[PDB]
Amino acid sequence: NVESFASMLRHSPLTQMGPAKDKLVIGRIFHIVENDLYIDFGGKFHCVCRRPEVDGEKYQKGTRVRLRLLDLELTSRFLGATTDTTVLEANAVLLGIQES
Template sequence: AGHTSSMATKLARRTNLSKLFKGYHRCFRATSCVSVDGYKKLLEDRDMQLLKQKIGGFEVTPAPDLSKQNVTFEALFRRSKFCQLGNFSGSIVMGKVIDVVNDDLYIDFGGKFHCVCPRPKRCGKSYTYGTRVKLLLKEFEMADKFLGSARHTSLLEADAVLLGHMTQKEILQEELQENILY
């Protein structure tokens, strides 16, 4: 008797599921006729709508598709984030802690070299691997002509001051900007 009741339960579940998914195959067949480019465009439009809802009143415009154009290196370089920085000294940039050695934080901000900042004494334990931070960039590359040297020598790091943690709003805006530009 127990075996037949479990069979009846399975049958009831199966019929309920078939009612739930009735007509589902028709939708699947219809979407399979859409071209890959059309489907990609549909997903991009949906993503743009979701981003507009998250951000609010900002106008979001997609970046031009450079893959189909014959673009020179000079044009790409002018549009790069490197050129958008302009004069480096005094710029506030966002970075991510990539290593912690004793009380030194190694921070990647997207420049040629990382910067090394001392861990703050107040709330210092909150600065761990992967923490998003704000930096005041002093020098993009610390290089100088040292005594007795004929050429400039690079210390292979940037000079920056740690300003603190990034807020959730700043993190969201940075991710949005990265998605739009690239």
């Protein structure tokens, strides 16, 4: 009884989410540069969000925040290009801090 990859993919939380547009997820802040917060929400790419002005002091390393995903990966194909231009980051809108 060995779980196959298709079984792993089907039951994974990312797969059952469906489209990533307008989905509330929880991410973890791992790297902070000035006011730019790098938040990883379990996807392939992290998301960069500006530090909110209302409560910017609480946003630190390891803090868990709430995100509204807009795109797992930002790509777009421009004029004359043979492949999409990838930013190697995700697009999300910062909402607040997750509290239990």
